[PDB]
Design a protein around this ligand. Sequence first.
Ligand SMILES: C=C(C)[C@]12C[C@@H](C)[C@@]34O[C@](Cc5ccccc5)(O[C@@H]1[C@@H]3C=C(COC(=O)Cc1ccc(O)c(OC)c1)C[C@]1(O)C(=O)C(C)=C[C@@H]41)O2
Lengths: 532, 121, 94
Amino acid sequence: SYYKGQTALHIAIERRNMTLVTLLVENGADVQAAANGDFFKKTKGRPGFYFGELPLSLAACTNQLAIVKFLLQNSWQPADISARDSVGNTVLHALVEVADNTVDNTKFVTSMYNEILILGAKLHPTLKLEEITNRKGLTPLALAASSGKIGVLAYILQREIHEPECRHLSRKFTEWAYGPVHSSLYDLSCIDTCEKNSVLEVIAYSSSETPNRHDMLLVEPLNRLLQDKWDRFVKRIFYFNFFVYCLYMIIFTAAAYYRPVEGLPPYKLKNTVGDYFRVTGEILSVSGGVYFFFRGIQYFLQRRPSLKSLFVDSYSEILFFVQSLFMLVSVVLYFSQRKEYVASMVFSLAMGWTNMLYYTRGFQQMGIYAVMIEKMILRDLCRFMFVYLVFLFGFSTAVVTLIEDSYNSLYSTCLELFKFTIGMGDLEFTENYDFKAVFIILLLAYVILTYILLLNMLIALMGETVNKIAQESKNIWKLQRAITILDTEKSFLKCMRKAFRSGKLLQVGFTPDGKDDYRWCFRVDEVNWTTW
Amino acid sequence: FMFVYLVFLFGFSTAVVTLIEDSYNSLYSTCLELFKFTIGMGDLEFTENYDFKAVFIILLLAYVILTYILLLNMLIALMGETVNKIAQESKNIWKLQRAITILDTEKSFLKCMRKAFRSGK
Amino acid sequence: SYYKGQTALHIAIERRNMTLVTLLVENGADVQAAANGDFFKKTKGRPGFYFGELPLSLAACTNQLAIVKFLLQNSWQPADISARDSVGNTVLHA
Ligand SMILES: C=C(C)[C@]12C[C@@H](C)[C@@]34O[C@](Cc5ccccc5)(O[C@@H]1[C@@H]3C=C(COC(=O)Cc1ccc(O)c(OC)c1)C[C@]1(O)C(=O)C(C)=C[C@@H]41)O2
């Protein structure tokens, strides 16, 4: 369990003993066998350090490049690089999981990663090690993208090896240096329409736990790729969707405004042009409601977000789904001869208009207002509700109790006190209650405590949030644009087929196996003239 | 911010007018009353006995909390940011404005340019 | 169009080859002629780097002062400083 498979070779490794590892692997110890334990497993419930399961993986993670280079080439018992553990981390994946974005750690892990890839290329030209998906089903590229490791991902995105024998693994090819512009040719390997965990998907679909999601899309290839996707086809599809939604909301508003007032539903169709227009508008409205219901169900089934992180990452989808629910309840009440249907429909009307702020996320300068509204409704107001309600209820019950012998009921007292809290009430002291002085004291304390002291506290916190997320306009709207691009591409399969997302699918080299490979790529010209 | 506010105003105005068709009589007056709410200048009464009174109260309270407490203060925070940003750079701003007015004054009256003696010698 | 007027003298320039420019301008290449292309023009719709049109302008913009000093004084074919391109940038303007 704890000490399952661990031997003196690991202890020599972690202590940096050059000769002990050589002696042990000369003795014939089977480095294929893996050591696992509670301390090794990535469990928060127990203390431990994760270094994979393969002993070669531990040697690599523990900063020993010559030692692992010998282990691999040790004729007595070479270690297999392609070993995949039950936990689901390969040696390369183990290195990815070790990294913590630090500059020195970035340099260390990148150097050892490049060295180990070169060694593997020397070892097994026939096999490509990178693409083998690990136990969880995501390759080291996808794992680095999803986990948050910007340092490990940046190099892999612009992984260029100047050795002419390693050109079949380099990701970035420098086409020429005609000037400060340096033409590029990335591999776009499994970035778009590839597999379960594409790089863009894991970057964007992530549950926001990752700590540097915004900075990931600043890498050299991702920015150009997303901008190309936006300009090519996505932009006009989004604008068409916005226009169709505006028409839908206008039709819904016109249909609901001119609803019949005499009788109970359903309402018999009368022979008039206006009646035909009204009924067709109602049919279109209900059709849109059904569409949004099904799109919400499809989204929730696809992503299946966790209950805790449901609202944080799916605010707009939640709101569209709730609007669809309201309209469906309205139609259900319509055919049950209940006049209450209207009361539901208006909630789907008022809501339907405000949901249009979703589309402001498709513009740069106007896109932050939706973000601010979402954050100020989920973070500040939500948890200030609890702080306010103890005050409201305490003083409401106290006032009602004091004068039992507009403040007659508990509902009206709560409403009047809430009006006081927003500076919208009248202090009169006109009626001759019992204990008038105590009533005046209670109301003045409430007004000073909630109107002057708590309301302004809430406003200060809201201003802090607005201030904080108003600096980061570029990052915020870039991420929102990326998410909408992903959703637009994924919604219409024919759209993905006709996207021409990649620049081209050309074979720009010959593999050491002897067969030239056709790889996807796109141009990325970057200007750097100061460095000459 | 006009665009962000008008969706709220129109959505809740149309909703309120639709809800009680059977001061909130017309669409113009409903829009005006809701705008007055947005600037803390309206009266919550709930005195007339409408249909669906609870839903009407819920709609108005949501509107007041969303626009008077949440959007208006957002606008005020952004305005304060702008004021703060262009209140540090007093010297540069007024220097540029003085330069522009000098140019326009010199260019307006040709005799003024002739008699300017702009150059030292 | 793209490769209109560009010759090996420019390629020696941008790579910082001291001797290649001397050889080319000893060969009698007419440095009066200007090279223009889509990459050279200051167009946002296309990628490119602007360095004027005159080859001397490119030599100057590409950080080569002794080389241009010789081009100007090269008795075989001195470059004219006062050359004005159709785009509208002089060497100084470049
Ligand atoms: C998150 C949820 C469920 C929510 C659903 C409704 C009831 C909502 O009240 C809240 C709670 C609330 C109530 C009153 C004041 C503030 C907040 O906030 C929103 C929700 C809060 C909004 C605010 O409008 C928006 O957020 C638009 C919007 C912003 C950003 C988006 O990404 C977006 O995509 C859809 C939409 C308006 C209402 O949806 C609306 O139109 C009505 C009548 C009630 C508002 O519950």
